[PDB]
Amino acid sequence: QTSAVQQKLAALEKSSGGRLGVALIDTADNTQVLYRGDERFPMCSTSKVMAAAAVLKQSETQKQLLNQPVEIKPADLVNYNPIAEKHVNGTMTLAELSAAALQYSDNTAMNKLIAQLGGPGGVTAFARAIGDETFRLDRTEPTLNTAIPGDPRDTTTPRAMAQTLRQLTLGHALGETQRAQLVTWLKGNTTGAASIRAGLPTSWTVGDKTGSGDYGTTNDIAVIWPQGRAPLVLVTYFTQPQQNAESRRDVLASAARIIAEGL
Template structure:
C-alpha cells in the first residue's frame, strides 16, 4: 500500500517530546465525527502542550495512512491521560473477547472454569484454529478463554457468549461496570461487519479503556482471576506488530487485537514495567472503503506517539 509522504514518525515523536508539559492530564480531540457517541458535543481542545503535540502527530498519522484513529491511554500511577477521538464510536471487533473473558471470569466458579464446555462441529464458525481441533470432545472453560484471547478463536468467543447467556448478558455486565456506551448486539463473525454509522457492536476508546482497567487492574475480579486474564493476554499470538511494536523497551504488553471490515484494526492493552504503575492503552482505527486493507503499522506508530505523550 502506498501512503502519501509526510514527516517521519521520528519527527512526530520528537515534536511530542519537545512540547511536554507539566500537567498530569490531557485530552486532545478534533471535531466530533458522525460516529461519535455524543454527536452534538462541542469539540474539546488539548489541556496541555504534550497532548496538543500528540493530537498533531495523530492527525498526521491519519493523513499518512488514510484512516481515522481513536485512542485513549492512561498512566494509572500518575493519572496522566491522552485521548484523541476518545468519545467517537468504532467497531470493537475481536477486542470484545477481553470483555467476554472478564465477564465470564467474574461469573464463574473454579469448578465451572475446570468443567468441559461441550460443542460440536455444527457450532464452528470461521477462524477457529483451536476449537476446530476439539469439536465433539469439548474444552475446559479456562481453555476456551485462552483460545479466545491468545488465538482470537471465534468459536471460543461464541462459546463464551453462550456461557454468559448471549450478547445482552455481556452488555449487562458492562453496564454494571458503569459502561453506558458499548453496544453489544451480535456474535462472531457477524460483529465484524463494522458498517459506518451502525452503532451495533461498537464502543469508544474511553469506554473500552475503562472496561479493560476494571477487569485487568480493578476489583471486579479477584487477584487470581485478574492474573489469569492478563497472563492469557500476555500470550496473545496476534499482537506482536501492534502496540507491542510501538511500546518502549522494557515494557510488557498484554493485549487483544481486533480486525474487521472497513480497514478496522484495533488493539487494547495493559502495559507494565518494573517500578512503574500499569498503563492502559486503547488504539482503534478504521477506513472509508469496506474492502480497505488494515495497517498494523498505524497501530504501532500510534502507540509510539502515546507512549511519548505519557512520558514512558
C-alpha cells in the first residue's frame, strides 16, 4: 500500500527533481514509515556514526582507549578538517577524533577512526556484528563522498541505517556508558539545524549526523526526542542526477515535516 505520508513524500520528491529515501522508526510502537526504504544511497559523512560507534565498542574492553593519542601529520589533511588542522605535528586522542568527526564533520578525524578499525572493512565488520547486513564502507575520506549514481561503494539503505541508529543510540548494541557517550556527541552536533531539525517543532530535541557529497547528495540521520512521546529515529537521504548539483537541506527538512505531521 501507499500511505498518505508516503504520497506526500513522493510529491516532495517529484518537485525536488532528485531521489529521496526516508526511514522512520517510532519507538512508541516500533512502527516504521519507509519511502524508498530499501534503495541504496551514498552515506557520505553519515557513515561517521558507524565508525565512531565501532571505536566505542573497542573501548568497552580498553578503559584508556579513548585517551590514546593519534599523530596528525600534514599529509593527513584532506578536504575538510577544521579540528585536525589545529593539531598537525601533534596528536589528538580517539575521543577527540570521535567528537571532531561527529560534531564538526572533520574528515581527517574520520580517517583516523577508520585506521583504528583496520580500514573501511573494519567499519563494515562492526556493522555486521550489530546486525546490519546492508551497510558497506569501501573507501576512506574524501573519496567515499563521490556519490556516483549506481555505485554500491559507501552506501546503505534508509531502512538499515534507521535500524542501526536505533540499536546504537537507544538499544543495546553498545554498553550503557558508550551509548550515552554517542548520544551526547550526536546531541552536540554543530551542523544539523538546517536539515531534519528544521522540519520539526522547536520543543523536540534532536541529535543527528549530516552528510553531503557530489551529485548534490544531502543526508541526515537523527534520533529525536519529541515533546510528550517516545523517541523516534529518522533517516533522510537525498541525491540528484548531475555531479555538480547544489545541496538541498530544505528537502530533508520538508521530509521531516511530513513525517512529524503524520504521527
